[model samples]
Structure formats: C-alpha cells, structure tokens
Target: MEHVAFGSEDIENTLAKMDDGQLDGLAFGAIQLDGDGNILQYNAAEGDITGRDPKQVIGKNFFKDVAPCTDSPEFYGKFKEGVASGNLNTMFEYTFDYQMTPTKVKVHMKKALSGDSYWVFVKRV
Candidate 1:
C-alpha cells in the first residue's frame, strides 16, 4: 500500500518521550491499515526509506499506488482469511531493491483491532 504518515504532532511527542531503549526495539517504516484496508498511518522512517513524503502518499487507496508486492489475490485473500479466523501473525523477510546495498527487512503482520484490517510493523533485521 501507499504508506502515509500519521499526520499528528502529538504522536511525534509521544515518540520522543519514549526511552531510547524502547526506540531501539522500534522498527522503522510501519504501515497502519484501517478496518477496511485503507492506509491510516505511515512512519517517517518509511518516508525516508522510500524517498516519498507523507503528503505524496496518504489516502491513495493503499493496494494500488504502492507496495505492489502485496497486490495478489492469494496474499490479500489469505490476509482476509487470517483476520476473519482470529488474531494472526505472519513474518516475512525480504530486501528492498531501492538501495544498491542490501536493506534486509522483516515485516510482521498482525490484527490490531477487532476488524479485518491489520497493522504491519517493518523492522530492518
């Protein structure tokens, strides 16, 4: 999906207030999806990685504009199925081609709320 920033100044403060130890545990480039699979929040780390600003991506019908790697019937279908079934967790490791050097990324997907949509937290592993 086209990642978008959370667009809230308060959230920035919240992040800043967190301890450095907690920050290390945090992975950059998170993607948040609403209940209907729409892009809700994207992190600054993501913007830096993708070289796309928040204003360029937010509300662009996630599955279409970006992250084409996720655009598949099997992927989306299985994601929906997993969400429908119960709380789920899936992990995938891959490298982004944007940078010449390897940028290993581990993506964890989980159901965040009582809804079909899920949250993907991306960490460079």
Candidate 2:
C-alpha cells in the first residue's frame, strides 16, 4: 500500500495538550469498505477498540457488526455520497453502544488515493 505523510507539527502540538488519560483509553480503527459496506480492511486498533476479533469482523459488513450506529439510511447515504463526490473531509458525531455505555463518537473521514475509499479518524467523547 502507498502511504503519504505530511508535516502537521502545529496540529500535533495542539492535540498533545488536549489528549488525556481518558483519551488514552479510547482507540481508533480504520475500515476499508466496499459499496455494499462490506469490510475490506480491518485494522488492529479497530478490532481492539470494538472488542471484536479480526476473524469475526473481516469480510463482515462494517456498518453492521463493527459500527451499527452508521447503519441508518440517512447517515450511510451521506457517507456514500461523499465517496462518490471525492470529498476529502467529513466530520460528524454519532452514538453507539460499542461497550458498557452508549459511546458518543466524533469521526472525521478523508478521501484517500483519489477516492478509492476513505480513512476514518475517530475520537470518543
């Protein structure tokens, strides 16, 4: 896979201060999904974050087991629309029961490699 890195010292420095022990407990995952919302890639962090083994998640529908909060038509449609339009960034917050409590997650997605798909960055709040 091709990877690119940019200089975001300013951004990283700002984020360093905002992060705390609570944030450390939270984790982020990257899922590459197909048009049908099937999981094409499930990163290790994602598996740990959601408490699902990779074996149980890979090839499964991402919006089903991995992130059912995004299963609704309205939200899913918007995500697909962004992919279709080659949008670079999208930010939104949603609630899900990923664990003991209803987790409120804020996600930021960016188009990667000419919109082959997207990379999702998530924060728990």
Candidate 3:
C-alpha cells in the first residue's frame, strides 16, 4: 500500500521550507541531494531505514554509493531525465539491496521548488 502521496505542489512547497530538525524524526526516509546527486542531507529516519549511519551516507553520491540499487536506467536515469527536463515528480515501487535484507519500498523523487536540489522519500512496503 502507498502510505505517502508523491506528486503534489503542496508537498513540494511544504518540503522546501523544512529544515534538518524538521525531517529528522519522520517515520519515513527523507534525503536531500544536490543536482549532481551528491548527498546534502540524509535524515535520521533514512539512517534507520537503510540501516546505515548518517555519517556513512552524508557527503556521498546517493545514486552511486548510498543506494547502489538505484544506479541503473530505471532509477538514476529517470532522475537525470527529470533534472534535465526541470519537472521531476515521480514515484515508483522498488526493491533495495544495498547492505541489509532486500526490502520492497516506495520511492518518490521530486525536484525542489527552492533550489537545484531534489528530495527523495522512501517508505517500506
């Protein structure tokens, strides 16, 4: 079941104003990445979800290092396409197998309303 709504102007607007403190305690994973896919923010919820410490993911490339399962045509390619087109509000179901057990998840990627960053929201299914 989809627990989070992905594409919405309201969601984007709400996220743009949120800071690290606001995101840290969410029940779902929240990641902020620069246009180049470098990690800018990896919240605590994401750390627990992925079973990796924030220090391990922060300052790393999200598509390459943190979530290697997404470094593919179906995932990272879509991200690049969205960035180039300037309208990237997408959501899909995916399986992640980075370090821990394979987990089915809902992935939401959206371009930021404020800057060249993007927000990635993940929830286990």
Candidate 4:
C-alpha cells in the first residue's frame, strides 16, 4: 500500500483509509481521536518527537488527560468545528511546551468521512 505522509493537502481522506499499522508507520506524528476527543491511536513518530509513548496515552482524553493546554477554545474549538463541518482541512503553526522541550510544529487537522473520527497531524517546524 502506498503510504501517505504528513503535510499533504487532502491527507485526511487517504489517512482515513489506512489501518492502524499504516497509521503507525507514518513519518510524522499522528493522533487519532473520537468525537469526545479521546485519543484512539498515537503514532510512532509522535512518541519520539514528543517523548510520549503511544501505548501509554491511547484511549485517554487528548485535551484533558494528555495535553490540557489544547483544551483551549482555539485548539479544541477548531476540532469541534471540523467534526461538525465534515471537511476539516485546517492547518497552522502551534507550539508545544509541556512534557518536552518547547517545540514549534505545523499542525494539520482532518475529519474522516466514515465516522466521528478526527486526525491531527504534526510535523516539526
């Protein structure tokens, strides 16, 4: 199967078609979440970049248990809009300071066509 990388425009469609193993193989970090913001799948590159373990954080609430700062209106609000709007193709630069060194990353948010799943793509800036 041809694998899709981060930073690709319209990446979410291809990503939604991928299995969990393929998701884990992505070059950049990817966090898959449910409607309630639960972390369903965390990828390998993400763990290495953030010093987080995929297994440890999966099934937890992303904006609450994992990173509370993202619970803000700007971050979480966009997510809600994306899920609601159905075509969540938003991108921006965001900074992360918790659980690792302060890092700036390019974030991409995408909504799946099949279900209430959302994807957050991260690439170091």
TM per candidate comes to 0.61, 0.63, 0.88, 0.88
Q: What is the C-alpha lDDT of each candidate?
A: 0.56, 0.55, 0.80, 0.82
Model 3: residues >4 Å from true position, as ranges?
1-9
Least accurate 10 contiguous residues by lDDT in model 2: 1-10
lDDT (tens digit, per residue) of candidate 4 on 1-125:
34675667668667767777887778788898998899988988888878888999989999988887677777898998877776577888888878778888888888865578888889899
Q: How accurate is candidate 2 locally (lDDT)?
A: 0.55
Clashing pairs in 3: none
lDDT of 2 by residue, 82-110 (tens): 76776646667777675536767666655
Angstrom error at residue 4, model 1: 20
- The TM-score of predicted model 3 comes to 0.88
Instruction: Compute the lDDT of residue 66 as modeled in candidate 2.
Output: 68
Question: Model 4 Cα displacement at 72 (Å)?
Answer: 1.4
Model 4: colliding residue pairs: none
